[PDB]
Point group: C3
Chain length 412, copies 3
């Protein structure tokens, strides 16, 4: 035992102690048996924010022309440097453009930008924001991301997915770059700090299945036919609730298959806005430990997927104590697509194929074509076996590496 | 000190506590002094299992020709997808061939495959399994790995070491690939999911010395002449037992040398089958903490070398709580060799040079020539100083990077 | 709660416990809430020491000729192998030369060497040591590092920054390697194990600001104008001391900016030699936990910058329990400079630009030109805003990636 430790207050020398909960200011442990971390040491929020090189700076707007809408310096609400740029428009799209002092070669370069939504209203309270490159021939190439409420309420980087290209665009001879939106009754959004990242590696695909439906069994068989790895974005309360969701044994048996892995999606799927940050934190913590009891270990259980795609900087700050990376939701090919090097592991989206495989298969083919990473997702109740087989065969026939979320985060 | 925590049961507010053992469900620690992990958060077993791309699928056997032996679909027992290939043969080898719809280029690629042993019997209950590529000239190039009892009793991936090449083989212009065994009185094995991985980097060499014999001093001096890293696969009980084993001070002094590092080999060298999984787990745990007391810290002490080379999925499952990677034993060049990218950190072997340096020097030259990683090993009682000098000069003269196990795992 | 644990001595079954300090031999924790590590599991001291390939081993001095000074095989005192080279000179420099058996190509290679100071005296206690390549035209190219008291008192690898080049030096056709010093009344230094590492990737810049002076606000704006990331080498006691040092809220606000990160510099700036190792360890530990309370999380708070640049192997040994990487100080361009691949994360220096920007802007231009990493530093009280703008524009105009210390360590 020894004698009692040094000091005042209740001090005790024990042999063996059992407790439900231990709070300690400091703990000196000679040998630690604690593989099941809830609270992770890594804060991922700002690690990736300053990768690559700043291509466009916004610190002086003399080089930018407002083509449509309006542009002004914002020196109070600054992402980086001395100022950011306010983009503002009424009943109109905004389009601003910058002309290079010499021809730019952007072969193997992906694009990223800082964004904050102040106001957007019209056909949606959101807009696609599009980085358009333009060549010496006036062909465009478009990369895009979504400015939304919640996830855009505070400054956050988007890593832009390929969207479209005018046939024969000369990426070696880019003469201007342009930033533009859909038209709305009101637009007020801030931007800053455009970054260029090396994306010269192969294209890559990530597949996630949400919400632990019984069809995940047939999904695992289908995507298994080409060794494509599936992430089960798992809610542990949903297991054994009904015939429509996996049993505990089915989930464990699925995760034993070498291509299936689990990521956290909250114990009871508590989404942002629908619940308080505290209740979501409990859902996150409980999701983590329940999945760890089901054998989901560290590199896997460091990933989270936003319940119902809802998020904000509030939820990101909370989640950063427990997870390193998270994914939202979108309907279109550019939502799935990111450069291979991220600059935010929190803000990026996934393309749904619950509504039809077109946008996902467009993303997979574009991932191959333009050397990008595509994240595609579904619920296995919504999607038929034939739809899964279309996507699986698209991925097998494309020039992409199918990868886990763990692999993708390890590449950063 | 404060007042007692919220709750029923025995609750206590302490200042300073000492314990031999603490069991907690929840531990909230504001500052952690616990560098010596026993139980690691990372589960390496299935992380690497979906690296690279599935080259050959076994999901439809219409494309496979049974040259010798016999081939059938297994659908009750499947690594990946809807099916796996059963290979069955009597008083013969099995050899199955797939002819490509167009010429294949495998320059800088390495190969991997999923395997399970159902039965093998004859002169040995084990076989080399060989992936043979064949060119437009009918030159072969062969890579291989071993199907063994224990390590093949459940599905596991092998990552295939180069073995042989017919002079002038055109790796750019492969027309067919072949899976084949040695001849045996009975063969019954399942295969699935052949994977191609990028191995276009330089060749690499890893040297391990097992069981802490006193000759490790001369070994350290010899391999030190060319700064080649030595892994001591260490049993901490063996230190100070006899004049034939290192003293504690000698072992610490060896590890202070910049090229020497320690990996776990069980406190008392308990091996699979010879002892229960529980006893081996205790030996693994004690090995880890005794070596940590001797100063062997995290990236080093995350590696384990199987005692007497014995293992199975039972032991891998247990070891995955404590270690990230383990290595078995073999006698030939294709044992030492792997692609630079593994798909299993658990199933791969090492070539002995206890009996003679030939197959190890072959492995080093193959690693240089064909861009692969070679792991070579010995006991320093079995090997004379001039034999070590032959191997050390072989490594120094070859085009390979000599690396640590830590470096190799960080590259995955 | 359950019944009391197995054992003699004081045993207890608790529900909820609170403690200031817990000492445990074994802790079995089912769910760990301990993001704030003080003791890190990783021991970085010898991980990188045996990267790359040994070029000159000094294990046979038949190939070496003294141009000036004297040389012997040191067999009593050896970094690597059977021997080291003892370099000794009186009232003179030393310069020793090895002729290559053929034209070496060192395009994209960087250089590293083991060093120990026995004695250096005269005009200084210390010397630049230069690795000095000679081409087929008798042009030199020079890389260098500093031999000093303290940091050189025990064997430690230096990774050599570019220093100078005779115009038109053919790096593809190198004919002789030379090792040389400044002239001194006494020189007695041991060298061993010259290593070659691949540094063919892009050049890189790391910017650190020391000692939390209020000018860090203007620095954040200036380097922010180009998205270059700043490391605050932070002392947590200094916050709120004076108008001349940041407030706690200013420091937190600074670290919320995506390009500003914090690294430890000791709670109260206790430097080696000035205080005992125990006092410095307390300063290191308190620095770590106070900065963790300010929100500085794991990958950031795993870096430490030496207070007043003072260090030895004693401090490195102690620091290795808490940090992975540390940086000293120097006045000149080669002090900033390293290959992209280190071999010691502990012995490398930073170039001051407190005394004018010239040597740092030389280092930035050389980082671009020769594909190297440059670490530059200042105190924001010493440096005017125009000097910061000169450095910031130098970095933005150069061909370098500006990076965090975290990014740099993740690349190793
Ligand atoms: Mg700005
Ligand atoms: Mg299969
Ligand atoms: Mg030596
Ligand atoms: Zn969901
Ligand atoms: Zn052994
Ligand atoms: Zn300082």
């Amino acid at each position: 035992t020894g004698l009692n430790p040094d000091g005042l207050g209740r001090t005790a020398a024990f042999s063996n102690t059992s407790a439900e909960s231990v709070s300690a200011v400091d703990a000196t442990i000679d040998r630690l048996y604690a593989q099941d971390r809830i609270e992770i040491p890594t804060d991922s929020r700002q690690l990736f924010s300053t990768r690559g090189t700043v291509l466009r700076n916004f610190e002086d707007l003399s080089g930018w022309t407002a083509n449509i809408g309006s542009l002004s310096a914002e020196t109070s609400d600054v992402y980086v440097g001395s100022q950011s740029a306010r983009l503002t428009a009424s009943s109109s799209a905004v389009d601003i453009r910058y002309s290079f002092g010499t021809a730019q070669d952007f072969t193997g370069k992906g694009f990223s930008m800082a964004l904050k939504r102040i106001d957007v209203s019209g056909s949606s309270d959101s807009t696609p924001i599009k980085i358009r490159l333009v060549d010496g021939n006036t062909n465009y190439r478009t990369f895009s991301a979504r400015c939304r409420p919640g996830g855009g309420d505070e400054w956050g980087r988007r890593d832009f997915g390929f969207e479209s290209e005018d046939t024969g665009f000369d990426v070696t001879n880019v003469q201007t770059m342009t930033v533009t939106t859909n038209s709305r009754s009101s637009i007020d959004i801030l931007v800053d700090d455009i970054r260029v990242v090396d994306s010269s590696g192969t294209g890559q695909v990530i597949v996630t299945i949400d919400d632990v439906h019984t069809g995940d069994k047939t999904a695992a068989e289908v995507f298994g036919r080409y060794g494509i790895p599936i992430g089960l974005a798992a809610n542990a309360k949903f297991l054994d609730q009904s015939s429509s969701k996996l049993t505990t044994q089915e989930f464990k048996d699925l995760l034993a298959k070498p291509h299936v892995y689990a990521v956290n999606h909250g114990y009871n799927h508590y989404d942002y806005g629908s619940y308080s940050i505290d209740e979501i934190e409990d859902d996150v913590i409980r999701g983590k430990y329940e999945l760890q009891d089901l054998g989901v270990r560290e590199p896997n259980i460091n990933h989270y997927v936003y319940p119902s795609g809802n998020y904000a900087q509030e939820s990101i700050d909370m989640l950063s104590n427990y997870h390193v990376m998270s994914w939202g939701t979108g309907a279109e090919s550019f939502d799935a697509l990111t450069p291979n090097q991220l600059t935010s592991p929190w803000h990026n989206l996934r393309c749904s194929f619950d509504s039809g495989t077109a946008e996902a298969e467009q993303a997979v083919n574009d991932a191959a074509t333009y050397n990008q990473t595509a994240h595609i997702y579904f619920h296995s109740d919504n999607v038929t076996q034939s739809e899964m087989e279309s996507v699986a065969q698209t991925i097998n026939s494309a020039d992409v590496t199918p990868i886990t979320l763990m692999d993708f985060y390890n590449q950063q």
